[PDB]
Design a protein around this nucleic acid. Structure first.
Lengths: 162, 79, 74, 83, 74, 98, 71, 82, 94
RNA sequence: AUGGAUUUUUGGAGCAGGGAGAUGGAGUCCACUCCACGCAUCGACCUGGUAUUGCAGUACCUCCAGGAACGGUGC
């Protein structure tokens, strides 16, 4: 069940609860993110929850995409050119995925508008200094794992890793 | 109830000197004695004046017909 | 005068030297040739006064009605 | 003799609506009466000016011409004007 | 059509009138016509300076009326 | 009756320009002036114009040069065009065509 | 002839441009003589704001293009 | 006489239209109606002080038009006949 | 209080602006199923609370058990099944 | 085979950003300082402290102090 143009065209399309245009791509068992061209850059949000995607990569240039819900997939790596295809990405929800090393979260530093980030229920979470590492390497984030990035944490992350 | 048109008819009869507030122009207002008027609120004013609220300066006009387009507001003055 | 209305006033002023102020502050002096029902205006030997100062000598001129602020005889 | 949007506006009488004027003041409250020409009588208003400040008014009436737009409930979206 | 504005409810009440040009006046509604031209009695100009000056009974052309607000309960 | 008002009224300026194929300058709301011949006109002063010289004035239109604060005149030729009449301020007939 | 030019785009998502220069994007559900428009699930851009069900007066409308297909 | 009628005949022509707000529109007319509401296809539209955007379709409220620039080829004398 | 499509949350940090609260709520709760809508007001009465509505009932029950006492913006949230059925649910059902 | 005179389609729009300094850089533009932080008001928002534990379908939402980025209106 390839993510195909035909698949996207019959997919529930609606205005979500936070007033954004969202496309519903839940529970299709998609393994690879591809063929997004067919959405025609018409969505503010794309819901990819409960699928089998391994890597957050493969996006076309999508100027209107601001929210990506990627819950319960198998994300173990993040693509390197994400800001070049998603310039205004502001919210990224990665709860319950497979990111294991702090260094695998490095590609998120290039998403200049990224403000809401959630990486809960990922092995990487239990790594020593996981929170400070994210704060220093992705300073554009204001809310991390539903907790406010505070000044004291920023300073503390400036010492360690300076 | 007083109808607005009638108020004017009263101004006309009275020969009260009238001061007009113009549309989207605050720095200048117009003055004169209504001699007659029409269905479009176009006014014929006698011994009329441009009044510069900023410069405190008056420009003398004589016989004026002001299009109603400009009318914001109509008031009477004792002078 | 006993009621002198817009329409007759203007008609009396046809054949006469007038000046028209426009909403935009331009002024046009000339002989009023004619006016119509919508109060569009036709001047001859028109002159233009902008900032109250002679700018341009223009000749025969149509002024669209919606532009007119007021008309004065002189 | 009347426009489809106008019928939908009259349908919002008695509901809480938001109105922006031609000058960008934003008036939220109960729509009492809506005329054919979009003249709007409202009550218990919250007004939000262009500077951001708020105020409270009991009773207002805004001329239809000087309205830029209105926001109506979503309660209306369902029926009957789906055609 | 040629409808009246529904303003009988506001008759002989004190009102606050927002006009174009950022102009504001206050007075008692004495009457109106289908164009929403108003008669306002005991009218007061609320100058942008904060100062208020009494202008008496006046005509406001409906054209330039942005908004009105009752200072009474209807 | 209506033809009479076009014929003798202020719009006779347009009526005369179409008949004689003469030039007229149109002062225009856009702060531009359109100089040409009247192929057609109507009540609203919509017009179909030929051999139009549009003239206007500008500052410097910074794009890839300098500043040089000094007003600039501009013009451009337009053979065939339709003008919506609301934009009309003034319409001028003259010894222009001559 | 056909009158369809508006009726064609009905039910579609539409990008509407206002006279002040705002962008209203919503589902085009109804219009009229004056081009007063009914826009479902409507957002405003210049910054994005969720508005919801919007009636826009035609006086202040400039233009419209097709933004996306009907939901 | 009623010059909108003339414009209504220009379906399938390509034109440039200048708007009251300064915007410039180049596209192919699909329809002009009685209110001069104009509909186009294959449209390159340049708002004042932007680079152009291309739209497959655009619909203009008639009043917002300043003027149409017509094809040089256009046979006006034909079109002015009723 | 029987299982319900809508969950009632209280004990929420009321300093978060309303639109941010609703967007984080949506994000957090999307992991269990599609959230149809969220009702949250800042009135004195309703501040620190929210109603989260899900399309599926199983999603509401899972959310309730798994996020009971989850630290959200600093405080442990308290979740419960709502007393009544949500207007949106009633309209979607009949 | 169709409508330019107050709420819709023949438009009331157009146009300019205070003054100075042996200021700095590329008559014009940008940054900094001083006189007149251009002034006042409202909203959202940024720091702390502090109040509220409440079952809802919403202009906006505790209060106190400080900080002012943005938007609107008036002079």
């Amino acid at each position: 069940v390839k993510l195909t143009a035909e698949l996207i065209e019959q997919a529930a399309q609606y205005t979500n609860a936070v007033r954004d245009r969202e496309l519903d791509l839940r529970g299709y068992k998609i393994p690879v993110i591809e063929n997004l061209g067919a959405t025609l850059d018409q969505f503010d949000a794309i819901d990819f929850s409960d699928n089998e995607i391994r890597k957050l990569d493969g996006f076309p240039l999508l100027r209107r995409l601001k929210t990506l819900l990627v819950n319960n997939n198998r994300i173990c790596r993040i693509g390197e050119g994400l800001d070049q295809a998603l310039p205004d990405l502001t919210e990224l929800i990665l709860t319950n995925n497979s990111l294991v090393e702090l260094g695998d979260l490095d590609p998120l530093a290039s998403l200049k508008s990224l403000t809401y980030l959630c990486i809960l229920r990922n092995p990487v979470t239990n790594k020593k200094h996981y929170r400070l590492y994210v704060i220093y390497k992705v300073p554009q984030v204001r809310v991390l794992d539903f907790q406010k990035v505070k000044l004291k944490e920023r300073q503390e992350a400036e010492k360690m890793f300076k | 109830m007083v109808q607005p048109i009638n108020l004017i008819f009263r101004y006309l009869q009275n020969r009260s000197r009238i001061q007009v507030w113009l549309y989207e122009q605050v720095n200048m207002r117009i003055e004169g004695c209504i001699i007659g008027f029409d269905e479009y609120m176009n006014l014929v004013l006698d011994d009329a004046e441009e009044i510069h609220s900023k410069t405190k300066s008056r420009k003398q006009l004589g016989r004026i017909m002001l299009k109603g387009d400009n009318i914001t507001l109509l008031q009477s003055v004792s002078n | 005068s006993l009621p002198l209305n817009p329409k007759p006033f203007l008609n009396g002023l046809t054949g006469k030297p007038v000046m028209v102020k426009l909403k935009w502050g331009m002024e046009y002096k000339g002989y009023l040739v004619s006016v119509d029902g919508y109060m569009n205006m036709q001047l001859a030997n028109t002159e233009e006064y902008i900032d109250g100062a002679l700018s341009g000598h223009l000749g025969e001129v149509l002024i669209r009605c919606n532009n007119v602020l007021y008309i004065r005889g002189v | 003799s009347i426009g489809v949007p106008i019928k939908v506006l009259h349908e919002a009488e008695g509901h809480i609506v938001t109105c922006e004027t031609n000058t960008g003041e934003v008036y939220r409250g109960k729509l009492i009466e809506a005329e054919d020409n979009m003249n709007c009588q409202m009550s218990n208003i919250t007004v939000t000016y262009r500077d951001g400040r708020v105020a409270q008014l009991e009773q207002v009436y805004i001329r239809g011409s000087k309205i830029r737009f209105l926001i109506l409930p979503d309660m209306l979206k369902n029926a009957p004007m789906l055609k | 059509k040629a409808h009246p504005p529904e303003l009988k409810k506001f008759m002989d009440k004190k009102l606050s009138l927002k006009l174009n040009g950022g102009r504001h006046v206050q007075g008692i509604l004495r009457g109106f016509d289908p164009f929403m031209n108003l008669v306002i009695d005991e009218c007061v100009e609320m100058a942008t300076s904060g100062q208020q000056n009494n202008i008496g009974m006046v005509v406001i052309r409906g054209n330039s009326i942005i908004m009105l607000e009752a200072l009474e309960r209807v | 009756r209506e033809e009479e008002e076009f014929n003798t009224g202020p719009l006779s300026v347009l009526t005369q320009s179409v008949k004689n194929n003469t030039q007229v300058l149109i002062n225009c709301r856009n702060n531009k002036k359109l100089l040409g011949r009247v192929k057609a006109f109507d009540r609203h002063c919509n017009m179909v114009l030929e051999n139009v010289k549009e003239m206007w004035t500008e500052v410097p239109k910074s794009g890839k040069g300098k500043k040089k604060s000094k007003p600039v005149n501009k013009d451009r030729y337009i053979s065939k065009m339709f003008l919506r009449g609301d934009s009309v301020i003034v319409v001028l007939r003259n010894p222009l065509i001559a | 002839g056909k009158s369809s030019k508006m009726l064609q785009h009905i039910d579609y998502r539409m990008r509407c441009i206002l006279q002040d220069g705002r962008i209203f994007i919503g589902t085009f559900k109804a219009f009229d003589k004056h081009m007063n428009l009914i826009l479902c699930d409507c957002d405003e851009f210049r910054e994005k704001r969720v508005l919801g069900l919007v009636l826009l007066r035609g006086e202040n409308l400039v233009s419209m293009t097709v933004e996306g297909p009907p939901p | 006489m009623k010059l909108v009628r003339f414009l209504m005949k220009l379906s399938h022509e390509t034109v440039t239209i200048e708007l009251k707000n300064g915007t410039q529109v180049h596209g192919t007319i699909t329809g002009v109606d009685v209110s001069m509401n104009t509909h186009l296809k294959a449209v390159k539209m340049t708002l004042k002080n932007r680079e152009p955007v291309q739209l497959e379709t655009l619909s203009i409220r008639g009043n917002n038009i300043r003027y149409f620039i017509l094809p040089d080829s256009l046979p006006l004398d034909t079109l002015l006949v009723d | 209080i029987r299982p319900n499509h809508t969950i009632y949350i209280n004990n929420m940090n009321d300093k978060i602006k309303k639109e941010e609260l609703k967007r984080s709520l949506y994000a957090l709760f999307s992991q269990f199923g599609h959230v149809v809508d969220i009702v949250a007001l800042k009135t004195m009465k309703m501040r620190g609370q929210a109603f989260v509505i899900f399309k599926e009932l199983g999603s509401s029950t899972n959310a309730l058990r798994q996020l009971q006492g989850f630290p959200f913006y600093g405080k442990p949230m308290r979740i419960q099944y709502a007393k009544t059925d949500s207007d949106i649910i009633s309209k979607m059902r009949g």
